[PDB]
């Protein structure tokens, strides 16, 4: 009898300044009133959208991107990178028996001020002529590979802003860098940067947000 949707109005989420496409969709909120600002009810929302939907390309069907509303600009919720994670189906499909799973994670500050934890994954693989049926690593290979991956992730952060790291994640150049830096230890078929977690944001800096 109250019909809460009569007092709700719509806002358009403008996620990137750089991804491919600014329009990810719409969201709704109660009408701003004396004691409950609509911009207050907004501005903390996180939208998780597929990177395939952000880029227009289906080869990004995994790697969902989190974008949190940082500002409301005239019926436009401008968001910013909040984190990235693989899809559960993709991760579970990658994890198979008769191979070694190698995981690395680092906590590093971007060049501007952002504190992030980067989670990279890799899997051993058989050679092309391999007859042995499992292709396991020797755990000293695992330690060396984890060290190399940690160095690569730490160097790719701290040399980039959050935006530059976001623009580096999309082409998966870090995956190829890990592959070239580890190909002389173990083949490592399925290198990926499976997660980026935002631990601490700097001062809001609406100036830096206003790059879209």
């Amino acid at each position: 009898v109250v019909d809460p949707f009569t007092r709700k109005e719509w806002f358009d989420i403008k996620a990137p300044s750089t991804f491919e496409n600014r329009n990810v969709g719409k969201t709704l909120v109660n009408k701003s009133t004396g004691l409950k600002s609509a911009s207050d009810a907004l501005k903390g929302r996180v939208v998780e959208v597929c990177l395939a939907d952000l880029q227009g390309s289906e080869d990004h069907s995994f790697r969902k991107i989190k974008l949190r509303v940082d500002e409301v600009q005239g019926k436009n919720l401008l968001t910013n990178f909040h984190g990235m994670d693989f899809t559960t189906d993709k991760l579970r499909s990658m994890v198979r028996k008769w191979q070694t799973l190698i995981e690395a994670n680092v906590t590093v500050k971007t060049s501007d001020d952002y504190v992030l934890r980067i989670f990279a994954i890799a899997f051993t693989r058989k050679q092309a002529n391999q007859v042995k049926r499992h292709s396991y690593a020797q755990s000293s290979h695992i330690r060396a590979i984890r060290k190399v991956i940690s160095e690569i992730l730490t160097k790719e952060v701290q040399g980039s802003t959050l935006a530059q790291l976001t623009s580096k994640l999309i082409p998966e150049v870090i995956n190829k860098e890990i592959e070239n830096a580890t190909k002389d230890i173990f083949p490592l078929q399925n290198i990926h940067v499976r997660k980026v977690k935002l631990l601490k944001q700097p001062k809001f800096d609406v100036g830096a947000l206003m790059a879209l």
């Binding site: 289906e58 069907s61 579970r92």
Partner: peptide, 11 residues
Amino acid sequence: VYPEYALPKTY
């Protein structure tokens, strides 16, 4: 809404 979606699997 997507052509040839390649629906995922549950593991």
